[PDB]
Structure formats: structure tokens, C-alpha cells
Amino acid sequence: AARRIPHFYRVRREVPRTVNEMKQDFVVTDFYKVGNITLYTELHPFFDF
Amino acid sequence: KRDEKHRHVVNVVLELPTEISEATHPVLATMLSKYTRMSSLFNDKCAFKLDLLRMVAVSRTRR
Amino acid sequence: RISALPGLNNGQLAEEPLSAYVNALHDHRLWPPFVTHLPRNMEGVQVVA
Amino acid sequence: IEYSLPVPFHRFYSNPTICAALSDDIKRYVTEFPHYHRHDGGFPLPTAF
Amino acid sequence: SLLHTFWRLPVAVFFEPHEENVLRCPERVLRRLLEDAAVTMRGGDRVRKRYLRQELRDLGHRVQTYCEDLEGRVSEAEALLNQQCE
């Protein structure tokens, strides 16, 4: 694992943000608005989907 | 005979300079007592050097 | 750190990243008045003597 | 620098600056995608981690 | 390398990429993709068996030699207890 680390970065390919990562930049007052794309995910407080 | 193997594991393997003979290190003789018993790991001589280095380190403690 | 919003600047929509889109302090078009070197990237910049 | 390898393995302890300094290819990854130079854990970790 | 087409005249592409498939292809992205694939592939025996067999046989024979020498010592030297050899 350690020795292989540089080879991943040798590829010039950006990666997609996860849904959980995207959900963390919606400020509090508009997390409830239509523009919150991720809202269909948020079914359960204790669980991630 | 044993001349070849000990010369090998001193000068060829360990790359240790010629002035460092068996007399200048008793611990070196005690270690080549062990080293020549196995004929592997001779490609990565750095392992043998690090083992000798740490052995001489532990031999030189105060306690 | 104050210059551009790190919460929202996670991505690109052209060669330029969003941090360069949101504040001129980031983009490669605003040069400093004094230069000791030339910059790494000059995509849409031509320099004239 | 001659005897070290940088290991980003956590959403902390994964500073882009150190990794880009220590290895050439990670620095290429950063310069091609400058938006990844954030510190909020959105920097891509290798797929193993 | 080139491609031979039945229609001599091409068509201009229209409508979305979700009703007919099309290989769009800027040359730079294809070159970058090929280099990236090349680096990705390389970035992700019997002599050893002979070494192992030789070392195993030598360990066995060396154990035999040590045991033989030890037994010879325990015989010869301790035989002196009874003054067998004058």
C-alpha cells in the first residue's frame, strides 16, 4: 500500500466528490431549499444513504 | 574452504574497508560465526550492514 | 484564507478553478506590480515589451 | 527528502503542501488541479484509503 | 490506422448524447488518456524454488553433520572415563 501511493497521483484524473462531501457546504438557512441536490438522500438521522 | 566465504562476507558483502579486519572487531568475528551459516540475503547487503551496526550499538551500551 | 471561500471553491468549470473565478487575488491574469520571475501558467496572457 | 515517502491516509494528516513537496508526481497532480489544494479533507486520498 | 467508411459523406452531429452514441475525441485528451493508462498499468520464480530446495537440503545435511559430530564427541571423549585407550 505505501509504496504504491505515488502511482495513484501520477494519473492526471480528478475524482468525484461523494454525496456526503457535497452535503457539507450547504449553509444552515438553505439546506431545506430546492437547490439542495442531495436532499433525496437524507432519509434518516442516524444513517447515511 | 572458509577463506573464500569469510573474505566474501567481509569485503564483497559488507563492503567494509580492508583496514577493518577480524582483529579490530572481536564482535565482527562472533558475527561472521553466524553470517556465513546462511547463503541467502547476499544481494541486499544493506541488511547485513544494518544488523552489524545495531549489534555494535547494543554492544557499546553503558549498562 | 479570507480571499476566497474554501467551503464553496471545491471544483473547476474550465481550465481555471473556482477560487480563481471568485476572487481576482487568485487568478493568473492579475500580475503583481513587481516581478522577480515569470509565473507558472500564462494560458490567456501575452506579455509585451 | 531522499529517504522519505509521503502518506496521505486520513482526512486529517493529509496536507497537500507536504505531499507535493516530497514527491514530483503528487505535485503534478496538485498543479494540474489547483482546486484540490484545499485542507478541509476534500483532497483526494488514494482509492485504497 | 485510418478508417474506411461506406458512406463517402459524413453527417453533422445533432441532438443529445443519450439517444445515439458518438466517439467525440479531442486529440489532447486521447493522448493524455493513453499516457495515463500506460503509467497506471505498470503502477498496479522458479529460481526462487531452486533456492528454497537447495537451502532446505543444505539445512538437513548440516543438521546431520552437527548431530554426527556431537555424537562422535560424546562417544570418543567420554570413552576416556574407563581408560579404554591407553
Swiss-Prot record, chain A:
Compartments (UniProt record): Virion; Host nucleus
Domain of life: Viruses
Described purpose of this protein according to its UniProt entry: Self-assembles to form an icosahedral capsid with a T=16 symmetry, about 200 nm in diameter, and consisting of 150 hexons and 12 pentons (total of 162 capsomers). Hexons form the edges and faces of the capsid and are each composed of six MCP molecules. In contrast, one penton is found at each of the 12 vertices. Eleven of the pentons are MCP pentamers, while the last vertex is occupied by the portal complex.
Protein family (similarity comment): Belongs to the herpesviridae major capsid protein family.
Assembly behavior: Homomultimer. Makes the hexons and eleven out of twelve pentons. Interacts with triplex proteins 1/TRX1 and 2/TRX2; adjacent capsomers are linked together in groups of three by triplexes, heterotrimeric complexes composed of one molecule of TRX1 and two molecules of TRX2. Interacts with scaffold protein; this interaction allows efficient MCP transport to the host nucleus. Interacts with capsid vertex component 2/CVC2. Interacts with the small capsomere-interacting protein/SCP.
Protein name: Major capsid protein
From Swiss-Prot, chain B:
GO biological process, one term: viral process
Compartment(s) of residence: Virion; Host nucleus
Record's keyword terms, sorted: Capsid protein, Host nucleus, Virion
Signal peptide residue numbers: none
Coiled-coil portions: none
Domain of life of the organism encoding this protein: Viruses
UniProt GO cellular component terms: host cell nucleus; viral capsid
Primary site of residence: virion
Function of the protein: Participates in the assembly of the infectious particles by decorating the outer surface of the capsid shell and thus forming a layer between the capsid and the tegument. Complexes composed of the major capsid protein and small capsomere-interacting protein/SCP assemble together in the host cytoplasm and are translocated to the nucleus, where they accumulate and participate in capsid assembly.
Protein family membership: Belongs to the herpesviridae small capsomere-interacting protein family.
Quaternary assembly: Interacts with the major capsid protein/MCP.
Protein's UniProt name: Small capsomere-interacting protein
Gene behind the chain: SCP
From Swiss-Prot, chain E:
Domain of life: Viruses
Interaction with major capsid protein/MCP, as annotated region: 1-44
Localization of this protein: Virion; Host nucleus
Subunit architecture: Heterodimerizes with CVC1. Interacts with major capsid protein/MCP and triplex capsid protein 1/TRX1 at the pentamer vertices. Interacts with the large tegument protein/LTP.
Function description: Capsid vertex-specific component that plays a role during viral DNA encapsidation, assuring correct genome cleavage and presumably stabilizing capsids that contain full-length viral genomes. Participates in the interaction between the capsid and the tegument through interaction with the large tegument protein/LTP.
UniProt similarity note: Belongs to the herpesviridae CVC2 protein family.
Protein's name in the database: Capsid vertex component 2
Species of origin: Human cytomegalovirus (strain AD169) (HHV-5)
